[PDB]
Design a protein around this motif. Structure first.
Motif, PDB file in Angstrom:
ATOM      1  N   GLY B   7     -43.686 -56.425   1.151  1.00 36.04           N
ATOM      2  CA  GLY B   7     -44.644 -56.776   2.165  1.00 36.04           C
ATOM      3  C   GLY B   7     -46.006 -56.268   1.726  1.00 36.04           C
ATOM      4  O   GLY B   7     -46.965 -57.115   1.671  1.00 36.04           O
ATOM      5  N   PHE B   8     -46.174 -54.974   1.497  1.00 37.00           N
ATOM      6  CA  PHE B   8     -47.397 -54.525   1.367  1.00 37.00           C
ATOM      7  C   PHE B   8     -47.861 -55.029   0.074  1.00 37.00           C
ATOM      8  O   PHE B   8     -49.112 -55.201  -0.214  1.00 37.00           O
ATOM      9  CB  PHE B   8     -47.374 -52.983   1.403  1.00 37.00           C
ATOM     10  N   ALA B  11     -49.357 -58.423   0.636  1.00 35.42           N
ATOM     11  CA  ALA B  11     -50.629 -58.420   1.501  1.00 35.42           C
ATOM     12  C   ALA B  11     -51.731 -58.026   0.331  1.00 35.42           C
ATOM     13  O   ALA B  11     -52.746 -58.366   0.178  1.00 35.42           O
ATOM     14  CB  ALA B  11     -50.576 -57.380   2.494  1.00 35.42           C
ATOM     15  N   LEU B  15     -55.058 -59.979  -0.801  1.00 36.73           N
ATOM     16  CA  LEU B  15     -56.430 -59.316  -0.566  1.00 36.73           C
ATOM     17  C   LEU B  15     -57.393 -59.361  -1.798  1.00 36.73           C
ATOM     18  O   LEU B  15     -58.338 -59.750  -1.895  1.00 36.73           O
ATOM     19  CB  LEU B  15     -56.293 -58.044   0.054  1.00 36.73           C
ATOM     20  N   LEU B  41     -54.491 -45.259  -5.726  1.00 37.59           N
ATOM     21  CA  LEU B  41     -55.538 -45.486  -4.530  1.00 37.59           C
ATOM     22  C   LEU B  41     -56.781 -45.801  -4.954  1.00 37.59           C
ATOM     23  O   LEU B  41     -57.597 -46.317  -3.759  1.00 37.59           O
ATOM     24  CB  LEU B  41     -55.739 -44.070  -3.738  1.00 37.59           C
ATOM     25  N   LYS B  50     -63.119 -53.212   1.410  1.00 44.34           N
ATOM     26  CA  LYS B  50     -62.467 -52.072   0.841  1.00 44.34           C
ATOM     27  C   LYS B  50     -62.061 -51.691   1.964  1.00 44.34           C
ATOM     28  O   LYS B  50     -60.782 -50.894   1.710  1.00 44.34           O
ATOM     29  CB  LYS B  50     -63.588 -51.205   0.102  1.00 44.34           C
ATOM     30  N   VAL B  52     -60.090 -52.621   4.341  1.00 44.34           N
ATOM     31  CA  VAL B  52     -58.659 -53.453   4.593  1.00 44.34           C
ATOM     32  C   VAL B  52     -57.902 -52.942   3.374  1.00 44.34           C
ATOM     33  O   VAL B  52     -56.831 -52.604   3.529  1.00 44.34           O
ATOM     34  CB  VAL B  52     -58.852 -54.941   4.367  1.00 44.34           C
ATOM     35  N   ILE B  54     -58.041 -50.167   1.513  1.00 41.25           N
ATOM     36  CA  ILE B  54     -57.482 -48.579   1.677  1.00 41.25           C
ATOM     37  C   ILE B  54     -56.704 -48.426   3.292  1.00 41.25           C
ATOM     38  O   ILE B  54     -55.665 -47.774   3.061  1.00 41.25           O
ATOM     39  CB  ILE B  54     -58.747 -47.560   2.111  1.00 41.25           C
ATOM     40  N   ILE B  55     -56.711 -49.402   3.814  1.00 40.10           N
ATOM     41  CA  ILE B  55     -55.779 -49.424   5.015  1.00 40.10           C
ATOM     42  C   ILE B  55     -54.424 -49.748   5.007  1.00 40.10           C
ATOM     43  O   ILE B  55     -53.445 -49.043   5.155  1.00 40.10           O
ATOM     44  CB  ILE B  55     -56.567 -50.135   6.357  1.00 40.10           C
ATOM     45  N   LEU B  56     -54.312 -50.910   4.080  1.00 38.88           N
ATOM     46  CA  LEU B  56     -53.171 -51.158   3.735  1.00 38.88           C
ATOM     47  C   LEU B  56     -52.440 -50.157   2.677  1.00 38.88           C
ATOM     48  O   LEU B  56     -51.017 -49.950   2.884  1.00 38.88           O
ATOM     49  CB  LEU B  56     -53.365 -52.451   2.769  1.00 38.88           C
ATOM     50  N   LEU B  58     -53.084 -46.703   2.570  1.00 42.87           N
ATOM     51  CA  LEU B  58     -52.551 -45.850   3.380  1.00 42.87           C
ATOM     52  C   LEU B  58     -51.276 -46.069   4.371  1.00 42.87           C
ATOM     53  O   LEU B  58     -50.531 -45.058   4.473  1.00 42.87           O
ATOM     54  CB  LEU B  58     -53.881 -45.196   4.287  1.00 42.87           C
ATOM     55  N   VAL B  61     -48.582 -45.871   2.100  1.00 42.49           N
ATOM     56  CA  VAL B  61     -48.042 -44.620   1.737  1.00 42.49           C
ATOM     57  C   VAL B  61     -47.399 -43.909   2.878  1.00 42.49           C
ATOM     58  O   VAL B  61     -46.375 -43.216   2.811  1.00 42.49           O
ATOM     59  CB  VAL B  61     -49.620 -43.858   1.130  1.00 42.49           C
ATOM     60  N   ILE B  62     -47.801 -43.905   3.923  1.00 43.07           N
ATOM     61  CA  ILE B  62     -47.347 -43.028   5.331  1.00 43.07           C
ATOM     62  C   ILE B  62     -46.025 -43.521   5.392  1.00 43.07           C
ATOM     63  O   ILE B  62     -45.281 -42.641   5.640  1.00 43.07           O
ATOM     64  CB  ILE B  62     -48.450 -43.178   6.493  1.00 43.07           C
ATOM     65  N   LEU B  63     -45.793 -44.825   5.455  1.00 45.23           N
ATOM     66  CA  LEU B  63     -44.521 -45.429   5.697  1.00 45.23           C
ATOM     67  C   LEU B  63     -43.277 -45.296   4.867  1.00 45.23           C
ATOM     68  O   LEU B  63     -42.143 -44.761   5.028  1.00 45.23           O
ATOM     69  CB  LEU B  63     -44.545 -47.039   6.043  1.00 45.23           C
TER      70      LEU B  63
END
Ligand SMILES: CCCCCCCC[C@@H](Br)[C@@H](Br)CCCCCCCC(=O)O[C@@H](COC(=O)CCCCCCC[C@@H](Br)[C@@H](Br)CCCCCCCC)COP(=O)(O)O[C@@H]1[C@H](O)[C@H](O)[C@@H](O)[C@H](O)[C@H]1O
Ligand SMILES: CCCCCCCC[C@@H](Br)[C@@H](Br)CCCCCCCC(=O)O[C@@H](COC(=O)CCCCCCC[C@@H](Br)[C@@H](Br)CCCCCCCC)COP(=O)(O)O[C@@H]1[C@H](O)[C@H](O)[C@@H](O)[C@H](O)[C@H]1O
Ligand code: NA
Lengths: 559, 79, 80, 75, 79
Positions: B7-8, B11, B15, B41, B50, B52, B54-56, B58, B61-63
């Motif tokens: 999924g990521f 996305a 982008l 990263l 940019k 969007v 980095i948010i994707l 991060l 990464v967190i998940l």
């Protein structure tokens, strides 16, 4: 004795006028003190047994002190575990008590008994014993009266009230009620259809369980608020779990699988359409005369259609369930997530027709959420569903606490480092925060810049940050996750079962096939000669220990 | 994990505008590198927004790295 | 003995203040090391936010566990 | 982590107690509870008033509750 | 801690000596009864209150972290 004067009434029936104790009478006091002889004395002289103690002290909770018992002397005797006084008040030769009387809030004696239950062993024993005794006495006195379907002002029966309040002990007692005496066996809810050797078939009354037209037990439990004390444990009460599994296996699993397949198709089409987005200019993008272009536009139309569908499903959920703004963000996570994905899709559409290229940002957020929302369908499989529940719990407890502490440490050390830095590519807070975050993912440099004086200070700051976050906090997070995993197995299984129950109810309301079980004659007949048919759920049992199996079987010729 | 990674990756690749990472395979490999302690990263700049990107990254990464891998260790301990 | 075995938060806040005052002294002595003292003060000031997790049960217990981990496990590990 | 749950909760409670005492000394509002007549009187006839903290209890098992109650008309 | 718990909840149920007790019953109705806890020398003493003594005790005190769990003190602190 020396004060009752026949110069009698209006004095042996005098009551408090205080707003705090309004309605309290001498009969209430006599019952409270557990004085049988005094109660008989007051009853003889014409004391009213229908007196209502309407004072604030006797209200449910308004005002911290007080005891609620239903406001009536019969309810007071019932909720204080006084069987002899209850019997006397019901079957006295002067003024019998009205067993069907309703208090100010519409609660009868059964309702009050449910209200004073608190899910403790001794309380449960006393409450259920008194409930059974009152039911038997009411059947004897009024064979035709229907005690357990009298509702209060809120439209709840004692069973519905118990289910909606988390009184799990009372609920378990009610759903498995077996009264083994003649002329009152019709009050029971559990029956034995036949017994052969060690195996006996049980029949469970399903009236008001999975279809009531006012509030079924399943609907009440599944859609209860998060504050309900035992909401995740009530589906474990004997008949309900088997009934839910029966619904699943009979018709809901196939519909759920079809829904999952349709969602997978939708996500694949959305991903393909987004992957081949034109990169030429600003939207909207002109339609080329090619097979690929037509397929792409078809995919985009289907994606927008799915977004509209989920937006309207979210609106429908918000209207039908009306979340209380606390269960909104503490419950209903999946509804919110699907609705937010749909919102991103619709914002993308709006931006796209406004000639803005930020529609791509909105669309990729929608796509990422759409893929992560696949985890919703792990419910429907026991192991994956419990795993997803554990993931939710880890996020909500361990990751949240860790992230608060970690972000504090990261921001503090980043501001210190960036202050120490004199100039250059890393003299911004964002760049230094990113450099320090790289340490968390195994990519930290430790020499990412030299634009400073006092290299010793720089390395000391970096080493302190590393020791505190990487070596301490991350490994502590692993240990805390281990503790949580150890402690939440049963909770996670029960939560998964409640989630599947919600899915089953939703399917039954959005799919006359979904009908519990067979209509069977189970107690023969009522106190009146008429035979009573009840929808019953059959459960097979085997017991090698209590061979006796002395029961009032319904059908001979077992099977 | 494969659901989250795919999924990521879709996305992120959507982008991305063009370049060496505008294929699903390349971006999937870049995101998998995060799982083995090698995530960049900043592996590309071929995009608008940019923030969007980095948010994707991060969120992914967190998940996965911070939540799912450590949860796997805890579940292995239970087993 | 309770000074360095108890009263951790009092010591930490006092040490942060000491770094700040040393920074002031260096700054008016025309020394650029005031920046080093000041950044140490800033880092300690941010990490001292953990004191206020007391006041919330879950975060407070988490902070207590952090202290205990530091004092037992991290210390033994770091020596070896 | 497995061994220190109760210890950590108790330490946190002591920390909050220290905070509460420090606030009460560096903040006549901070006064415990109500002054009530509680045993009637001393061995001498004088009535004794004591600052008392009220705690509500419920017990469904020992129904007897044979006590020397101070006030009738509960509440 | 045992002596402290005994003292703080002392209920002497005999006439002519009930004044020695520290725990009282203000009223009882049905299953609910309201208790009164003597607070003299607990949170204000002008010499050393129990709360001040426990909170500021040295680290060597055997039960310093457990004494605040004795019945009245926890509720008083929460109040
Ligand atoms: C957030 C909180 C986590 C929610 C969750 O995971 O658990 C819920 C499941 O939700 C789902 O569907 C899938 C969850 C996906 C994983 C979370 C990822 C977070 C998103 Br935001 C990612 Br970052 C987006 C990435 C992509 C975009 C990133 C970029 C964006 C800017 C719980 O399920 P429930 O249905 O609500 O059941 C409740 C039950 O009824 C109740 O009875 C019980 O009490 C409760 O416990 C529930 O079981
Ligand atoms: C060090 C030891 C850790 C102390 C700690 O974390 O726990 C204390 C909390 O302290 C705080 O406020 C926050 C702690 C911050 C995290 C530690 C980081 C270390 C600093 Br130095 C970092 Br490296 C600086 C980075 C930035 C600079 C880096 C560069 C520098 C060169 C305990 O709290 P307490 O109040 O004392 O309660 C005691 C209680 O009364 C007693 O009753 C009980 O018995 C005891 O247990 C206590 O609970
Ligand atoms: Na690495």
């Amino acid at each position: 004795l020396d004060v009752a004067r026949k110069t009698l009434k209006q004095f042996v029936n005098a009551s408090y006028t205080d707003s705090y104790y309004k309605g309290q009478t001498a009969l209430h006091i006599a019952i409270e003190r557990r004085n049988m002889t005094l109660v008989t004395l007051l009853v003889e002289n014409g004391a009213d047994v229908q007196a209502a103690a309407n004072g604030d002290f006797f209200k449910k909770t308004k005002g911290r002190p007080g005891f609620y018992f239903g406001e009536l002397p019969l309810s007071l005797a019932a909720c204080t575990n006084q069987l002899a006084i209850v019997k006397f008040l019901l079957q006295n030769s002067w003024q019998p008590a009205d067993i069907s009387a309703r208090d100010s809030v519409g609660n009868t004696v059964l309702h009050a008994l449910v209200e004073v239950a608190d899910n403790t062993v001794d309380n449960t024993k006393f409450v259920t014993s008194m409930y059974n005794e009152i039911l038997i006495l009411g059947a004897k006195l009024h064979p035709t009266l229907k005690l357990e379907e009298i509702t209060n002002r809120k439209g709840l029966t004692p069973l519905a009230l118990a289910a909606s309040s988390g009184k799990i002990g009372v609920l378990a007692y009610i759903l498995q009620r077996e009264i083994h005496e003649p002329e009152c066996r019709h009050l029971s809810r559990k029956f034995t259809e036949w017994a052969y050797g060690p195996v006996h078939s049980s029949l469970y009354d399903l009236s008001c369980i999975d279809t009531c037209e006012k509030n079924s037990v399943l609907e009440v439990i599944a859609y209860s608020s998060s504050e309900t004390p035992n909401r995740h444990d009530m589906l474990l009460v004997e008949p309900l779990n088997r009934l839910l599994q029966d619904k699943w296996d009979r018709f809901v699993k196939r519909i759920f699988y079809f829904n999952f397949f349709v969602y997978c198709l939708y996500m694949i089409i959305f991903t393909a359409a987004a992957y081949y987005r034109p990169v030429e200019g600003l939207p909207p993008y002109k339609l080329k005369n090619t097979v690929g272009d037509y397929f792409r536009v078809t995919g985009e139309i289907l994606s927008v259609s799915g977004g509209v569908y989920f937006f309207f499903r979210g609106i429908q959920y918000f209207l039908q369930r009306r979340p209380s703004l606390k269960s909104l963000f503490v419950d209903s996570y999946s509804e919110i997530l699907f609705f937010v994905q749909s919102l991103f899709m619709l914002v993308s559409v709006v931006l796209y027709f406004s000639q803005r290229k930020e529609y791509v940002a909105s669309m990729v957020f929608s796509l990422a959420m759409g893929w992560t929302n696949m985890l919703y369908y792990t419910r429907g499989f026991q192991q994956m569903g419990i795993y997803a529940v554990m993931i939710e719990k880890m996020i909500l407890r361990d990751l949240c606490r860790f992230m608060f502490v970690y972000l504090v440490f990261l921001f503090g050390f980043s501001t210190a480092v960036v202050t120490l830095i004199e100039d250059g590519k890393y003299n911004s807070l964002y760049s230094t925060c990113l450099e320090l975050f790289k340490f968390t993912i195994g990519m930290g440099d430790l020499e990412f810049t030299e634009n400073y004086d006092f290299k010793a200070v720089f390395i000391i700051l970096l080493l302190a940050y590393v020791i505190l976050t990487y070596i301490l906090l991350l490994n502590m997070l692993i240990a805390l996750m281990g503790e949580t995993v150890n402690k939440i197995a049963q909770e996670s299984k029960n939560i998964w079962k409640l989630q599947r129950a919600i899915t089953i109810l939703d399917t039954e309301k959005s799919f006359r096939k979904a009908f519990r079980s067979g209509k069977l004659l189970q107690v023969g007949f009522t106190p009146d000669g008429k035979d009573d048919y009840r929808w019953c759920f059959r459960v097979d049992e085997v017991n090698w220990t209590t061979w006796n199996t002395n029961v009032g079987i319904i059908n001979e010729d077992p099977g």
